[PDB]
Write a protein that binds this ligand. Structure first.
Ligand SMILES: CNC(=O)c1cnc2ccccc2c1
Ligand code: NA
Length: 123
């Protein structure tokens, strides 16, 4: 149907927007602390602590499969990256402090993204 194609065009352009947001958020992680899943070889007990791991690479995989239906789903995954880190790592660590900075600096990007999604009506 024509309607289904229209919907797919919308999802595709949401995906385009979210890819830009993702790239912008990842730029705020030059240390690349959040680039890849926390290694169970480097951190054997991680999954005992964190029930839903997340990282930028995993987000990108879902993104490219057009697995984010709206900005809220994307934001949920971004929040997981931050929140997991602030629980697994203590306040005084380079890890925790990196999450705080990512959350603060990411907020600006997500604030405008929300306005753009609403504006262009991508969901
Ligand atoms: C977001 N990353 C982490 O939370 C983290 C924590 N500890 C680690 C220890 C050794 C190697 C990697 C680690 C990663
Ligand atoms: Na903690």
């Amino acid at each position: 149907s024509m309607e289904q194609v229209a919907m797919e065009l919308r999802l595709t352009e949401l995906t385009r927007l979210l890819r830009s947001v993702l790239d912008q958020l990842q730029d705020k992680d030059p240390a690349r602390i959040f680039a890849q899943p926390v290694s169970l070889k480097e951190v054997p007990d991680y999954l005992d602590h964190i029930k839903h791991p997340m990282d930028f690479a995993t987000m990108r995989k879902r993104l490219e499969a057009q697995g984010y239906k709206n900005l809220h789903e994307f934001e949920e995954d971004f929040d997981l990256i931050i929140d997991n880190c602030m629980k697994y790592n203590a306040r005084d660590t380079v890890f925790y402090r990196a999450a705080v900075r990512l959350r603060d600096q990411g907020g600006v990007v997500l604030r405008q993204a929300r306005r753009e999604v609403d504006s262009i009506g991508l969901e």
